[PDB]
Amino acid sequence: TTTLAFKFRHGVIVAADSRATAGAYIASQTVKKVIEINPYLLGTMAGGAADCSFWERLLARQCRIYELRNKERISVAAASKLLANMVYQYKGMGLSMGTMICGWDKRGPGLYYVDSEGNRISGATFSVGSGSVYAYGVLDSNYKWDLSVEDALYLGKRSILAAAHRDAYSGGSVNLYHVTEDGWIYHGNHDVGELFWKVKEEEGSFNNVIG
Amino acid sequence: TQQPIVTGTSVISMKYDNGVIIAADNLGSYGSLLRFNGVERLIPVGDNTVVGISGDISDMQHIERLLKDLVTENAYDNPLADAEEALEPSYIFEYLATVMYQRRSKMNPLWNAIIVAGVQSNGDQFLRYVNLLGVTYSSPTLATGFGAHMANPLLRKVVDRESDIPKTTVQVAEEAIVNAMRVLYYRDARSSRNFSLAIIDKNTGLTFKKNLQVENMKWDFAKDIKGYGTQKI
Amino acid sequence: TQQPIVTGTSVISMKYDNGVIIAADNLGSYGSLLRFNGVERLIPVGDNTVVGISGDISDMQHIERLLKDLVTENAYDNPLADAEEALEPSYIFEYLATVMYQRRSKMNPLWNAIIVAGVQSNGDQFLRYVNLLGVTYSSPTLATGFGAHMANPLLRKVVDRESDIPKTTVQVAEEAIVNAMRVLYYRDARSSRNFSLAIIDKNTGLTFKKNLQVENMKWDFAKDIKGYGTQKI
Amino acid sequence: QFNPYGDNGGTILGIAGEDFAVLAGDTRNITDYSINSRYEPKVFDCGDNIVMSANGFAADGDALVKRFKNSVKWYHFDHNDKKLSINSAARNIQHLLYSRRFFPYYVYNIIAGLDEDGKGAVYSFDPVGSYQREQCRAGGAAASLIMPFLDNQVNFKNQYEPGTNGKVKKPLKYLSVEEVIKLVRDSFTSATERHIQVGDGLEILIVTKDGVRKEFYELKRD
Amino acid sequence: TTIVGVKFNNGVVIAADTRSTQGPIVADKNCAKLHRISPKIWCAGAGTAADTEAVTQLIGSNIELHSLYTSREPRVVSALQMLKQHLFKYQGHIGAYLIVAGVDPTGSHLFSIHAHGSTDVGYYLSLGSGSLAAMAVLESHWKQDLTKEEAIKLASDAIQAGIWNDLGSGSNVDVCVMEIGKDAEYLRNYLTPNVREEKQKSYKFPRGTTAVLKESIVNICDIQEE
Amino acid sequence: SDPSSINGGIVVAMTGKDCVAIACDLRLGSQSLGVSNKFEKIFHYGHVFLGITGLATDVTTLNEMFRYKTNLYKLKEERAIEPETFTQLVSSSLYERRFGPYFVGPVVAGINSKSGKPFIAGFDLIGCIDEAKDFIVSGTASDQLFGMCESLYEPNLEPEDLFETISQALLNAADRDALSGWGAVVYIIKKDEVVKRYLKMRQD
Amino acid sequence: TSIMAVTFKDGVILGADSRTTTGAYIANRVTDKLTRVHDKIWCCRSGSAADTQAIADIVQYHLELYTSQYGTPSTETAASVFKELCYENKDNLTAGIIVAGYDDKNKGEVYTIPLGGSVHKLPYAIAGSGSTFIYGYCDKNFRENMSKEETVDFIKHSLSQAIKWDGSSGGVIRMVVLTAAGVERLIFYPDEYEQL
Amino acid sequence: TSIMAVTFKDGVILGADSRTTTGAYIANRVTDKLTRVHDKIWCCRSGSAADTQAIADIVQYHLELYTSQYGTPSTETAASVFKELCYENKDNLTAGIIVAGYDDKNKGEVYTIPLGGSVHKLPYAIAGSGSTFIYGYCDKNFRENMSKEETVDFIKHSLSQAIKWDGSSGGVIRMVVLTAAGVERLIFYPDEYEQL
Numbered sequence A: 001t002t003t004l005a006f007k008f009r010h011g012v013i014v015a016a017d018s019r020a021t022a023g024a025y026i027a028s029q030t031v032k033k034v035i036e037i038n039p040y041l042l043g044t045m046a047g048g049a050a051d052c053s054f055w056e057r058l059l060a061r062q063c064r065i066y067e068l069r070n071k072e073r074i075s076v077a078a079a080s081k082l083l084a085n086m087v088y089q090y091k092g093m094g095l096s097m098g099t100m101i102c103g104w105d106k107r108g109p110g111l112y113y114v115d116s117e118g119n120r121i122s123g124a125t126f127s128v129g130s131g132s133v134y135a136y137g138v139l140d141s142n143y144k145w146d147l148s149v150e151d152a153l154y155l156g157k158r159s160i161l162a163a164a165h166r167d168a169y170s171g172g173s174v175n176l177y178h179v180t181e182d183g184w185i186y187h188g189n190h191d192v193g194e195l196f197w198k199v200k201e202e203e204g205s206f207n208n209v210i211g
Numbered sequence B, C: 001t002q003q004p005i006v007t008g009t010s011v012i013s014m015k016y017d018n019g020v021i022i023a024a025d026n027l028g029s030y031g032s033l034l035r036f037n038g039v040e041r042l043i044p045v046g047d048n049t050v051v052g053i054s055g056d057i058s059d060m061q062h063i064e065r066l067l068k069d070l071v072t073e074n075a076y077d078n079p080l081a082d083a084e085e086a087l088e089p090s091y092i093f094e095y096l097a098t099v100m101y102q103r104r105s106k107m108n109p110l111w112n113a114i115i116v117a118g119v120q121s122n123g124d125q126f127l128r129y130v131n132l133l134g135v136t137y138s139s140p141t142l143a144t145g146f147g148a149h150m151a152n153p154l155l156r157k158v159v160d161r162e163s164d165i166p167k168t169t170v171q172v173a174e175e176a177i178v179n180a181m182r183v184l185y186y187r188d189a190r191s192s193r194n195f196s197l198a199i200i201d202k203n204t205g206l207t208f209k210k211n212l213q214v215e216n217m218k219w220d221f222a223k224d225i226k227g228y229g230t231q232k233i
Numbered sequence D: 001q002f003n004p005y006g007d008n009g010g011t012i013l014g015i016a017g018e019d020f021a022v023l024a025g026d027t028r029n030i031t032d033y034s035i036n037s038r039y040e041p042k043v044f045d046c047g048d049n050i051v052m053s054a055n056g057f058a059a060d061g062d063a064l065v066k067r068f069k070n071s072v073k074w075y076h077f078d079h080n081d082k083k084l085s086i087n088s089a090a091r092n093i094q095h096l097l098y099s100r101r102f103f104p105y106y107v108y109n110i111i112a113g114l115d116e117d118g119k120g121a122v123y124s125f126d127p128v129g130s131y132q133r134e135q136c137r138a139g140g141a142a143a144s145l146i147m148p149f150l151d152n153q154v155n156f157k158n159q160y161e162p163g164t165n166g167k168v169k170k171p172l173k174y175l176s177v178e179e180v181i182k183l184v185r186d187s188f189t190s191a192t193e194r195h196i197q198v199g200d201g202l203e204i205l206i207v208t209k210d211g212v213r214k215e216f217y218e219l220k221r222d
Numbered sequence E: 001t002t003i004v005g006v007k008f009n010n011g012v013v014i015a016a017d018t019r020s021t022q023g024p025i026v027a028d029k030n031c032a033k034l035h036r037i038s039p040k041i042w043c044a045g046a047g048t049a050a051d052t053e054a055v056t057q058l059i060g061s062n063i064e065l066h067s068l069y070t071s072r073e074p075r076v077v078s079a080l081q082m083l084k085q086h087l088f089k090y091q092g093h094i095g096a097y098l099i100v101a102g103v104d105p106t107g108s109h110l111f112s113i114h115a116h117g118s119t120d121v122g123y124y125l126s127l128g129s130g131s132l133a134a135m136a137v138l139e140s141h142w143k144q145d146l147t148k149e150e151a152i153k154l155a156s157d158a159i160q161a162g163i164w165n166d167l168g169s170g171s172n173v174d175v176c177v178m179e180i181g182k183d184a185e186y187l188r189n190y191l192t193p194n195v196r197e198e199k200q201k202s203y204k205f206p207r208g209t210t211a212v213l214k215e216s217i218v219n220i221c222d223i224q225e226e
Numbered sequence F: 001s002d003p004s005s006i007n008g009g010i011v012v013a014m015t016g017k018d019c020v021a022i023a024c025d026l027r028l029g030s031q032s033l034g035v036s037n038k039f040e041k042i043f044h045y046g047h048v049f050l051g052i053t054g055l056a057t058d059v060t061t062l063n064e065m066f067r068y069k070t071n072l073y074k075l076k077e078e079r080a081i082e083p084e085t086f087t088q089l090v091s092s093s094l095y096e097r098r099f100g101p102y103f104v105g106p107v108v109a110g111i112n113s114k115s116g117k118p119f120i121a122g123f124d125l126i127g128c129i130d131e132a133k134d135f136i137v138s139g140t141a142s143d144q145l146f147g148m149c150e151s152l153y154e155p156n157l158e159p160e161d162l163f164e165t166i167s168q169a170l171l172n173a174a175d176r177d178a179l180s181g182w183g184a185v186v187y188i189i190k191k192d193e194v195v196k197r198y199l200k201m202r203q204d
Numbered sequence G, H: 001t002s003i004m005a006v007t008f009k010d011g012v013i014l015g016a017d018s019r020t021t022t023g024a025y026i027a028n029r030v031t032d033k034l035t036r037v038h039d040k041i042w043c044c045r046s047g048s049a050a051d052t053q054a055i056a057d058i059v060q061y062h063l064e065l066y067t068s069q070y071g072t073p074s075t076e077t078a079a080s081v082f083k084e085l086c087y088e089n090k091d092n093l094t095a096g097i098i099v100a101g102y103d104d105k106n107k108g109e110v111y112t113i114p115l116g117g118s119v120h121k122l123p124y125a126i127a128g129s130g131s132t133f134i135y136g137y138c139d140k141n142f143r144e145n146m147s148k149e150e151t152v153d154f155i156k157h158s159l160s161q162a163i164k165w166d167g168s169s170g171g172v173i174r175m176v177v178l179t180a181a182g183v184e185r186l187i188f189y190p191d192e193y194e195q196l
């Protein structure tokens, strides 16, 4: 996998590839690694597909009962912490999860990294997965706070592409999301095969590759 | 988790036009030691089912008791225990298969391979296999252990598919089983000459044959074999 | 590196006023199996030395051949081979000790424990031990294997230190050795009743006794022992 | 040491049409280099126009199917004979699988049927409950042999329109049941040639609004 | 693999299947497991494929040189002895399991040979993963004083048992008959009971379907004159 | 750790009517990392073509080795080596390292200059020959290639038809393998003309 | 150990050596391996000394309680109680037991219970490390319906050989005769049985 | 395996079963384990089939070369050559061999060579996995200076029991008689020896 997310002026961008692997064998290439917890909350998946899917779906149900008892949408911090405490019970037992809880709440846009090891970190920029290391190069070099929605969406898309190209266990297609205070907005599924050639021509990058 | 101590080898079986046949030798081995020579590994359940068991003998004796108790329990408050609500081969098998899978799921298995052979109420032939892992399958011929490697090929020459079953008589089927038992005696180092054979026919019922022996063996050609290559004397 | 297969148990020995005594049973064990009942483990070298060997019997037979060849080689171009330039116990021992240490240093040992017993030219008693590691030591009493644990305590009651040697006669020393061999038969699970005994005296020379048996055993008290605690019948 | 798992071989294949769905699988059961059965059904009609096949370790596959069939039975009892939709079954199966996250069902699992809009649906599961709706999916021993062929012949991957030279793709035209069954038979005939655990027979279950139909074809017995 | 050897009245016959595996995958559907050591000495091989070939080519080469040196037709016992000593020396690491048969001035012979260097004599033998399925047939149908035609039938029936019942064996049956006073007849694909059925569809593509970037002529010829 | 899957790669060869074709991917990796998209795995010694998959150092080494041996063969024999003869030389050379083998999966392809007969062959890492009539596959996506070739292939294909068949077999197999791709090349070989085509594929 | 039990005309006779070992050291040379679980139901013990003692003690408790409620138990019943313990605790035990008893109705009966916890009713039985060496001798020399004197000689000769070849067997030969007449203990010393 | 060699009045007789195994599979049921290293010096082979064949072949070569230079070798000499191979290569071999031969001077002689490579001259010898079960029977029934017919029956009965109890032993009983009269091969089939 490659997944990323970052805070900025106009909310938070969330992007991810779609490849699923079983050794060298590419089992699927149509996997949704972004889970919609509520119209204002997203969750990313990396590592154990089954683990990430189960626990984040179970979290979405915790976040919903919260809204019913409290007449109030759960905060990003509280949601991230419920997950963290849930997976902490099974620590050392074999769980493999690398997630980011992205959303907009009362404190503005929120972004937390949560994993099966026990980490829970608030931050403006994250990337988790086998291809995260490639994505960080593009993010760190081009990331501002004063970024337009159009340019921010492109950055997250271009970052996954960088990783999808180099990392053997990343690719397929890019799923984009933009989270505002009026909720998240899906910005499509983009095949890396087609996207790569397009970006190569328009941007001039990947000069080493022939096409 | 354990290891098997006293063991029973192959159990072989096949379907024929009117029923099923099943056979197994009378040996209880203790590693390489052929310890117990009078062990019955075919266990009838009523007059319509025979359970053939291989593997650990202590676990076999346990299963034998579960089956005996099953008959006792089925008769309780059951006026039709010797008629419509009698035990069927399919009931007996599913019970065992349930137990075997539960025991493997607790990491404390019954170290056996079992073949349930019988004839149902409607006259249909029943033949199904189950083992220590809870794995089940059915086929026109079934065999455990070495029999799977040596007997099945011979029995599949008689009944290669489902459509060959009606064409196969009891005389032909028994002949094939008896031949397979001879071959296993030639080639299986944990087998015995003495064996038991059971036939469950939809017309003539259950016939249980004990104290059978492998006969018509070929050994005479051994006298001409000398050395391992170059030796002449 | 290997493992011992066919093995010999304890060899026991002690000094007395005029010489040395050495003894060992006639058994060649094959694990828990008491395979070979006629094995001689005391090997005389001339009329002044006896080498007692325990451990691997194939390695013992090898050493036995080295010693036989040593005698042959010493006689070569040696007019005084049966006199002044005859083989001494100290020569024979140092040779073996050299071989044992060299073999362990190549990580391919002779899997034995050896006691060389004899009387020197000047009448001095010789008694020294060597094993598969090349480890050597001398004492008024010496024993290998189980004998080290059971025989030495009994023999050290007769000769506790160097000054007790002149006070110890051949009749007393032999009596102690014979008693120790009985105790080892009671208590060592890899021992036999039959044994050989050798005396090397500075006056009467080499006396080699074969086909000795452990006698005067106590077993009668066993009849009164019943159960393991509470049982009365 | 006791090993609670085993490998019974077998291969399965699900393809979703526009108004139908197929679930195919070979009928061969094996341990190591021995054949247990040449005809041991692996694909089942579970009710409510849903077909299912779980295998690898036969004993775990039989148990999962048995449990899901039971889940359908109790869904009717508890919710007024309501029809269990394919998406609801998929989610239910996830929870059956994850209930043994620390002693997994050692199986590949595929279900097929029709969605609530009447269109064909195929869902794929990993041993611990990660599931995906797909158009085409093979599972089991020869999954890696078959899937690339289906990427090419069902989704027209790496196929472009002549004359344009890589500028315009082959358009995604839907497939008929007759065209799909051809791909299924060719897939399994090819897998039988190069995989030793695949052969003997091929059983196909087709699902339409009218119900569930079966088709059986022989395969090589070597 | 399944391989067998059967003696008869005036000679000996060997047979083999034609499958070669790489795990659960079939690498070759029509592999040739019957090897010629000398004109009238043939061996069938099971185990590590390269080893059965290499060891056979080597001993066959040395047998040919021996035959030339001695001005005699090679003997089966010579091939047997040379093989077992070679295999014993490599202590089983050369995974060749062979059935060696042939006719020579001494008569007809049939031996088996294992990777560790042990040999066995018999009237009927079987090696490989399907050896049990094949031996079941041989033990059921073999008799003394077989004819050539009866022996070929028995041998191919034994291989078929392996083909059908053993997953490590499949495809076709190869046979080689070595009769006294005759040329050895090598019957490649004696039986062909596993032909693939016609495919339902043709997957021939329209020309221009594949996207191309560059084209170029490859110069395979040498440097030219002028 | 597994030497045969560190660098990744695939090779496939097919026969046609009076023609042969051999193809390969262009990827060289260090496990998950992609290092080069120009690592061609097909070499030729005169009119005989050799594709090699597996450990890249051994691929490079064996090419240099067979170039060495075929150049000497030619100087002594006064003629180019043929595919049947070259196939035996590859087998001989691999088995001489029986107990310290090159971690490779070679594939030979060519047309006998005298008989005009198309020829392909495959080997395991220690030298066993697999002489096939239809096709040969090798690499990390060998299972995938077997599935594509066994269903797409039909005998007696014309050069321009064979090109499409082998290209689609390679491309779709590579797209189901993480360790294969990053470009592809196809050689179409006839008795006295050889065309080489680079394919356009997804670069992930 | 070397243990055996043999049925004969008038009942049954149990036999055993008297050696218990810790490696090659003989921890006790006058052991009594023939233990009583009821008046005329005895057992021969082989394997772990601790395990076989613990088992025999529990069985004696069960049969004592059985007797208080239901009267004298059968030899088959005693063998079943042994089995239940040996089978259900097979993972944690190392016990090879031979059960022998005398009824007036059933007369002499012998049941052997090896490691797994299986039960086998036999005319005679042998067990222990030393039994391996006398399978051939016992099979050739055993007859049914022997006399008391013939059966004593059969056991004496059999255990003599077992002791001769097995290092883990030795000492005295103990025997227990179970008949209608009562319970007789016999003992035979090395000087007697070694010269056979 | 089950092998034995027995000296008697007129010479010596070798005996063996015919089973060779690969685990529980019987790879050959008509094996000839009685192998000739010289005209009247034979051996019984147990252990690895490959190792014992390689050894016997080397010994036959050594004794053939001995004979060409120094005339007929003694049975002791043959046993020494076996020993030298088995002892010096003990780390890499698994061979249990019994050497038997007939001289006119020394008459019948038997040497056994177990795993370690030690040599033991005996009146009779038994070896192989199946020998364990007949130590008692053979010790009780062996006499010195038996007749040919008595010795054949002794071996037949002994190997019959060994085969009966050992799964690694079976098939036919082969025998080789070594006397002044010459060399006689005997064979006994299951139907004959099982009913003993």
Ligand SMILES: *[C@@](C)(CO)[C@](*)(O)[C@H](CC(C)C)NC(=O)[C@H](Cc1ccccc1)NC(=O)[C@H](CC(C)C)NC(=O)[C@H](CCc1ccccc1)NC(=O)CN1CCOCC1
Residues within 6 Å of the ligand: A001, A002, A019, A020, A021, A022, A023, A027, A028, A031, A033, A045, A046, A047, A048, A049, A050, A052, A096, A129, A130, A169, A170, D101, D104, D125, D126, D127, D128, D130
């Ligand atoms: C990138 C693509 C890889 O790092 C991402 O991290 C993605 C994240 C997405 C899918 C949410 N991760 C994977 O693709 C992930 C990698 C992985 C595999 C196994 C454990 C942890 C991480 N892949 C999976 O989770 C696959 C998804 C399947 C192919 C749809 N699942 C498996 O491989 C399953 C799960 C196994 C399992 C996990 C925990 C306990 C028990 C079992 N395993 C199998 O299907 C068995 N496997 C089949 C292939 O042959 C080998 C055996």
Ligand SMILES: *[C@@](C)(CO)[C@](*)(O)[C@H](CC(C)C)NC(=O)[C@H](Cc1ccccc1)NC(=O)[C@H](CC(C)C)NC(=O)[C@H](CCc1ccccc1)NC(=O)CN1CCOCC1
Residues within 6 Å of the ligand: E001, E002, E019, E020, E021, E022, E023, E027, E028, E031, E033, E045, E046, E047, E048, E049, E050, E052, E095, E128, E129, E168, E169, F004, F054, F103, F104, F105, F123, F124, F125, F126, F128, F129, F130
């Ligand atoms: C039946 C079919 C199976 O028992 C027969 O016994 C045949 C015998 C005939 C063909 C002579 N045996 C095989 O087909 C044999 C089975 C086998 C496999 C592995 C070990 C021993 C036996 N198959 C082979 O030998 C193949 C032949 C190829 C397909 C042409 N070779 C391999 O599988 C090699 C094994 C090489 C080897 C080296 C050292 C010791 C033992 C074996 N394996 C590979 O090539 C796998 N891998 C591919 C990627 O590159 C790295 C190696």
Ligand SMILES: *[C@@](C)(CO)[C@](*)(O)[C@H](CC(C)C)NC(=O)[C@H](Cc1ccccc1)NC(=O)[C@H](CC(C)C)NC(=O)[C@H](CCc1ccccc1)NC(=O)CN1CCOCC1
Residues within 6 Å of the ligand: G001, G002, G019, G020, G021, G022, G023, G027, G031, G033, G045, G046, G047, G048, G049, G050, G052, G094, G128, G129, G168, G169
């Ligand atoms: C013959 C000897 C063989 O079958 C008999 O069966 C007799 C039976 C009579 C005594 C009941 N068996 C023994 O004597 C028996 C043999 C034995 C040994 C170890 C395990 C099982 C059986 N010996 C013992 O039980 C002795 C009795 C002590 C000396 C009083 N016990 C030990 O040797 C204990 C055993 C502890 C144990 C280990 C594993 C499983 C169960 C129990 N061992 C030790 O004290 C340490 N010992 C010495 C160093 O080597 C390790 C063992």
Ligand SMILES: *[C@@](C)(CO)[C@](*)(O)[C@H](CC(C)C)NC(=O)[C@H](Cc1ccccc1)NC(=O)[C@H](CC(C)C)NC(=O)[C@H](CCc1ccccc1)NC(=O)CN1CCOCC1
Residues within 6 Å of the ligand: E114, E116, E118, H001, H002, H019, H020, H021, H022, H023, H027, H031, H033, H045, H046, H047, H048, H049, H050, H052, H094, H128, H129, H168, H169
């Ligand atoms: C009886 C059986 C026991 O003492 C006899 O001694 C006979 C003697 C005659 C044949 C000389 N011995 C055997 O039959 C002998 C038993 C044996 C087995 C293993 C090691 C030593 C002795 N059997 C064999 O030697 C067979 C003969 C082959 C089948 C023709 N060989 C094997 O079993 C080989 C030996 C490899 C080996 C292993 C360890 C040490 C030395 C050699 N083993 C295998 O092929 C492995 N086999 C396949 C996979 O399953 C495990 C067993």
Ligand SMILES: [Cl-]
Residues within 6 Å of the ligand: C228, G020, G031, G032, G033, G049, G053
């Ligand atoms: Cl005790």
Ligand SMILES: [Cl-]
Residues within 6 Å of the ligand: B228, E118, E119, H020, H031, H032, H033, H049
């Ligand atoms: Cl042999």
Ligand SMILES: [Mg+2]
Residues within 6 Å of the ligand: D191, D192, D193, D194, D195, D196, D197, D198, D199, D220, D222
């Ligand atoms: Mg197949």
Ligand SMILES: [Mg+2]
Residues within 6 Å of the ligand: F174, F175, F176, F177, F178, F179, F180, F181, F204
């Ligand atoms: Mg790829």
Ligand SMILES: [Mg+2]
Residues within 6 Å of the ligand: A163, A164, A165, A166, A167, A168, A169, A170, A171, F203, F204
């Ligand atoms: Mg990638």
Ligand SMILES: [Mg+2]
Residues within 6 Å of the ligand: G163, G164, G165, G166, G167, G168, G169, G170
């Ligand atoms: Mg003793």
Ligand SMILES: [Mg+2]
Residues within 6 Å of the ligand: H163, H164, H165, H166, H167, H168, H169, H170
């Ligand atoms: Mg036997």
